[PDB]
Amino acid sequence: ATQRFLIEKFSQEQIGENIVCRVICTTGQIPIRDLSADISQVLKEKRSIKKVWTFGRNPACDYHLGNISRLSNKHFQILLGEDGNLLLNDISTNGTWLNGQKVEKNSNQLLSQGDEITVGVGVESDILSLVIFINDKFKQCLEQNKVDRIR
């Protein structure tokens, strides 16, 4: 049964236990990962920000890339909070790119559906791109932003 379950595992229960956003490298360099935040913490904690991810060549960074000199330990960072949306914070030494458009470092930007962040700009052959996937399930809960106090 494991043989079928392995395949079915893809289609069956959709992933999104408490996932915020999923980072997927389209240029084929970094392995896909799942970013997540607790709803109770976000719904209970209504401050400036809830949870933020740090991405880069650093093993500490919430995201471990390959090994590109053009990228910094923590090339970019993603923050989750505000209300029911997401924000992208660039934190690279050389800069973080969005669909070819370079954004202001350590600046907050409104996330986009299936958005993509490019990094390591300088040489056409030294640029790396990343795609961000927003969890529809998560948005559903945040969209309502209402405490499920209904028995």
């Binding site: 000199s69 053009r70 990228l71 910094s72 330990n73 690279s92 030494t93 050389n94 300088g122």
Partner: peptide, 13 residues
């Protein structure tokens, strides 16, 4: 060590 640029800042010029 010479100068192991941990992360080049793009020598713009």
């Amino acid at each position: 060590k010479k100068m192991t640029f941990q992360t080049p800042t793009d020598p713009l010029e």
